[PDB]
Design a protein around this motif. Structure first.
Motif, mmCIF file in Angstrom:
data_model
loop_
_atom_site.group_PDB
_atom_site.id
_atom_site.type_symbol
_atom_site.label_atom_id
_atom_site.label_comp_id
_atom_site.label_asym_id
_atom_site.label_seq_id
_atom_site.Cartn_x
_atom_site.Cartn_y
_atom_site.Cartn_z
ATOM 1 N N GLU A 381 0.793 -1.241 0.000
ATOM 2 C CA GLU A 381 0.000 0.000 0.000
ATOM 3 C C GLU A 381 0.827 1.294 0.000
ATOM 4 O O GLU A 381 1.248 1.767 1.054
ATOM 5 C CB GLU A 381 -1.062 0.011 1.122
ATOM 6 C CG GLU A 381 -0.546 0.211 2.548
ATOM 7 C CD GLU A 381 -1.673 0.353 3.560
ATOM 8 O OE1 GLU A 381 -2.559 -0.524 3.580
ATOM 9 O OE2 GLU A 381 -1.682 1.340 4.328
ATOM 10 N N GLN A 388 1.442 5.842 -6.282
ATOM 11 C CA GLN A 388 0.421 4.834 -6.546
ATOM 12 C C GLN A 388 0.165 4.723 -8.039
ATOM 13 O O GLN A 388 -0.255 3.678 -8.539
ATOM 14 C CB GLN A 388 -0.874 5.201 -5.819
ATOM 15 C CG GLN A 388 -2.029 4.251 -6.084
ATOM 16 C CD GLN A 388 -3.383 4.866 -5.769
ATOM 17 O OE1 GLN A 388 -3.490 6.061 -5.485
ATOM 18 N NE2 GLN A 388 -4.426 4.048 -5.827
ATOM 19 N N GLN A 411 -6.336 -1.490 -3.223
ATOM 20 C CA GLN A 411 -5.074 -1.965 -2.668
ATOM 21 C C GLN A 411 -4.623 -3.245 -3.367
ATOM 22 O O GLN A 411 -5.429 -4.137 -3.630
ATOM 23 C CB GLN A 411 -5.207 -2.201 -1.165
ATOM 24 C CG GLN A 411 -3.882 -2.411 -0.456
ATOM 25 C CD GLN A 411 -4.059 -2.795 0.998
ATOM 26 O OE1 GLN A 411 -3.166 -2.587 1.820
ATOM 27 N NE2 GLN A 411 -5.214 -3.363 1.323
ATOM 28 N N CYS A 437 6.196 2.308 -0.293
ATOM 29 C CA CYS A 437 5.042 1.494 0.070
ATOM 30 C C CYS A 437 5.335 0.605 1.274
ATOM 31 O O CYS A 437 6.493 0.346 1.598
ATOM 32 C CB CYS A 437 4.592 0.645 -1.121
ATOM 33 S SG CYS A 437 5.937 -0.211 -1.978
#
Length: 648
Positions: A381, A388, A411, A437
């Motif tokens: 995540e 992202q 996710q 992450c």
């Protein structure tokens, strides 16, 4: 035609651990041969391809592939520590793939340098037939000359730069010691050639070319392992081995032709020899992307020929592709070419659909060379919107390089062969692609299945109605369907919309929430309406049916079972077998080899966490082992109950 003929080609790779000086041996081999996936170079009127080998031996598919890519090999052991476990694993699979080798003992110039020793190890550890074709003069600070036993000549090393090497004749003190060494060398070779046996047991005369003719025949047949020596950093014996690679190591023709099945016939033997007459056949062993020329696909051609500005067949993807220009990466330079003749290696620029493991083939032809479900998964995540975005990109690329994993973005969730596999993919994303992450704990992928049978209906009132029989399939057979409808009580158009409805409901699972597998279903009956029945309204029926069966067919949870192969001294077996049995494992079969016992077991992957640390602790760095996924088995009652309670 070509530049170098087949007989003039050598496809090699270097297996060793850096602690044996892996970098410095390659670094120097590149220099001397030069006047990266695969580096095209040359030595003494011979094409030499140096193919890179995986950074870690725990990668079985990588290691296995590079092995079918390379014909020959060279090995580097530390003169002080002799053969070591890391290379031991890989020495054996080399043998399974029939890779001829010559051993090069390095770092002779260092404290604790013992040649006689390292040679012994191959014997006591590896059960290998090997004899030195050279003897060292001096050790540690003294390492000075080298005796070539075949020519019976000595070379003195006056500098660390490998220049001005003055040939001489063997000093008498070493003359006798040398006499025996060559004699013991001929014996070790003579074993497999009985025509040689006569010459030796008849005290006949053994010439040079005659003896060299003998050795190469035993080495390409993997029945012998000539041993050499030197020190890489100081440029000693390096030029000697390179010579040796020519005299001994195999060509593309001196080994056993590669084998694959057919696009039509999944099981048929297809031999691809090296022939320019024959049709094109080739395999792609790596891919990478350059900032200028674009996507780069490395490969090797086992049969036929090829040219740029033409079309070929990717038989792994069932697609047609056009070849752009072609590049060879030399030591310090890149060279563009037209034709890649059989037995050689180049890189293809610009390709669309070809990844790692993909098989390029002629058009009129079919054959495929090479040929996966995840038992483990992770949750990653990223911190904020910025990254992202990138991850979601990087993921997209990677399947091209290593199609051994998969991504679920619900996710993210990734899964693959093992705890190491993942640990790379993440550590690629983190560094190569610079992604911040947080990674969760490693987790095994469980499954669910049926131990019983039943006939159920489910019905949706919009309207749809179905009657399905549910029987558990045998383990590993997967999921199967049957359309039993006859008079069209269920209209045909709506049939496939059921089968689709069934899975999506199965994926989610009825018990702990894991995918449901190994189940057979038959649709025997139903009914409908014309203003209500949908392709949509049924799916909910298949959903409702599966749920009815879940109250009946007695579902259970499956966990993946691993096949562990262990090797150690027979002293500790008291421990290991005590160690396995506490892991919910059992011992099936066994066998020794050399002085060590080979244990063969079956263990739940969920109990295999923290193993190596428990091996090296019981056996003191002595133990070794491998692991594979094998089959699926049912979790014990009390454990399954925790999986049920934990996931709410």
């Amino acid at each position: 035609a070509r530049e170098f003929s087949l007989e003039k080609t050598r496809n090699i790779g270097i297996m060793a651990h850096i602690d044996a000086g892996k970098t410095t041996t390659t670094e120097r081999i590149l220099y001397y041969t030069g006047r990266s996936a695969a580096t095209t170079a040359a030595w003494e009127g011979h094409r030499v391809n140096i193919i890179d080998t995986p950074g870690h031996v725990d990668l079985t598919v990588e290691v296995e592939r590079s092995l079918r890519v390379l014909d020959g090999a060279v090995t580097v052991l530390d003169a002080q520590s002799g053969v070591e476990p890391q290379t031991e694993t890989v020495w054996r699979q080399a043998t399974t793939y029939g890779v001829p080798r010559i051993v090069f003992v390095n770092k002779m110039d260092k404290l604790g340098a013992n040649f006689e020793y390292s040679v012994s190890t191959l014997h006591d550890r590896l059960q290998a037939n090997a004899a030195p074709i050279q003897l060292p003069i001096g050790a540690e600070d003294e390492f000075e000359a080298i005796i070539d036993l075949v020519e019976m000549k000595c070379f003195k090393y006056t500098n660390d730069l490998g220049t001005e090497i003055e040939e001489i004749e063997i000093p008498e003190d070493h003359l006798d010691r040398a006499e025996e060494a060559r004699a013991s060398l001929i014996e070790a070779v003579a074993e497999t050639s009985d025509e040689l046996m006569e010459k030796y047991l008849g005290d006949e005369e053994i010439s040079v070319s005659e003896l060299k003719e003998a050795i190469r025949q035993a080495t390409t047949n993997v029945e012998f392992y000539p041993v050499l020596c030197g020190t890489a950093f100081k440029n000693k014996g390096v030029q000697l081995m390179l010579d040796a690679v020519i005299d001994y190591l195999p060509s593309p023709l001196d080994v056993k032709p590669i084998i694959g099945h057919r696009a039509s016939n999944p099981e048929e033997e297809v031999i691809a020899k090296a022939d320019d007459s024959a049709e094109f056949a080739a395999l792609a062993f790596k891919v990478m992307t350059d900032p200028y020329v674009g996507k780069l696909t490395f490969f090797r051609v086992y049969s036929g020929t090829m040219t740029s500005g033409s079309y070929v067949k990717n038989s792994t993807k069932g697609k047609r592709e056009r070849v752009g220009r072609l590049l060879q990466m030399h030591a310090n330079s890149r060279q563009e070419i037209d034709t890649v003749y059989s037995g050689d290696i180049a890189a293809a620029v610009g390709l669309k659909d070809t990844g790692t493991g993909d098989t390029l083939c002629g058009e009129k032809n079919d054959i495929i060379l090479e040929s996966p479900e995840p038992v483990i998964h992770l949750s990653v995540e990223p911190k904020s919107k910025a990254d992202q975005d990138k991850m979601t990109q990087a993921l997209v690329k990677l399947q091209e390089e290593d199609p051994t994993f998969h991504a679920h973005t619900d996710q993210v969730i990734i899964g693959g062969m093992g705890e190491l596999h993942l640990d790379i993919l993440v550590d690629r994303m983190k560094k190569e692609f610079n992604v911040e992450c947080n990674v969760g704990a490693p987790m095994v992928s469980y499954r669910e299945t049926f131990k019983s049978s039943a006939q159920v209906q489910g019905k949706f009132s919009q309207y749809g109605d179905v009657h399905i029989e549910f029987t558990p399939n045998e383990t590993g057979a997967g999921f199967e369907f049957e359309n039993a409808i006859v008079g069209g009580v269920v209209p045909r158009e709506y049939i496939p919309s059921v089968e689709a409805g069934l899975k999506d409901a199965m994926e989610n699972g009825v018990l702990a929430g894991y995918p449901l597998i190994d189940v057979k279903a038959k649709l025997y009956d139903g009914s409908y309406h014309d203003v209500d029945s949908s392709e949509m309204a049924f799916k909910i029926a298949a959903s409702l049916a599966l749920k009815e069966a879940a109250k009946k067919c007695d579902p259970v949870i499956l966990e993946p079972m691993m096949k562990v192969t262990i090797e150690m001294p027979e002293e500790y077996m008291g421990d290991i077998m005590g160690d396995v049995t506490s892991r919910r494992g059992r011992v099936d079969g066994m066998e020794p080899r050399g002085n060590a016992q080979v244990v063969n077991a079956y263990v739940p992957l969920s109990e295999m966490f923290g193993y190596a640390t428990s091996l090296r602790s019981n056996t003191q760095g002595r133990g070794t082992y491998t692991m594979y996924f094998d089959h699926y088995a049912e979790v014990p009652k009390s454990i399954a109950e925790d999986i049920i309670k934990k996931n709410k």
